[PDB]
Swiss-Prot record:
Annotated compartments: Nucleus
Main subcellular location of this protein, as a coarse class: nucleus
Tissue expr: Expressed in head and ovary.
Domain PAC: 63-103
Name this protein carries in UniProt: Protein cycle
Biological-process GO terms, alphabetical: behavioral response to cocaine; circadian regulation of gene expression; circadian regulation of heart rate; circadian rhythm; eclosion rhythm; locomotor rhythm; positive regulation of DNA-templated transcription; positive regulation of transcription by RNA polymerase II
Extent of the signal sequence: none
S-S pairs: none
Function: Putative transcription factor involved in the generation of biological rhythms. Activates cycling transcription of Period (PER) and Timeless (TIM) by binding to the E-box (5'-CACGTG-3') present in their promoters.
Assembly, per entry: Efficient DNA binding requires dimerization with another bHLH protein. Forms a heterodimer with Clock in order to activate PER and TIM transcription.
GO molecular function annotation: DNA binding; DNA-binding transcription factor activity, RNA polymerase II-specific; protein heterodimerization activity; RNA polymerase II cis-regulatory region sequence-specific DNA binding
The organism of origin for this protein: Drosophila melanogaster (Fruit fly)
Length: 103
């Protein structure tokens, strides 16, 4: 229910106009931080494995349902579809698109 985009390493580059209502953070508060700053302790290891897959394969990866820490330090449940796009001249990731469904 909201889109974000990230660097290859997970740094937030963009959140859409719907994100702040869901997660609390304004763009200026979250852009430039890693997605690893927000995952719940019990989900982060599995999410790192999803991120490793996204970096290696040029297909969509769907995460488990995980908990994401909002600005008020409570958690919401999300499920994300991630996909990375590589520059064909350098093999570096331009960005990862994230479709973040909210429960």
């Amino acid at each position: 229910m909201f889109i974000s985009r990230h660097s290859g390493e997970g740094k937030f580059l963009f959140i859409d106009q719907r994100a702040t209502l869901v997660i609390g953070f304004l763009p200026q508060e979250i852009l430039g931080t890693s997605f690893y700053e927000y995952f719940h302790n019990e989900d982060i290891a599995a999410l790192m494995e999803s991120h490793k897959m996204v970096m290696q394969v040029p297909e969509k990866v769907t995460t488990q349902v995980y908990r994401f820490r909002c600005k008020d330090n409570s958690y919401i449940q999300l499920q994300s579809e991630w996909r990375a796009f590589k520059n064909p001249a350098t093999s570096e990731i331009d960005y990862i698109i994230a479709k973040n469904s909210v429960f």
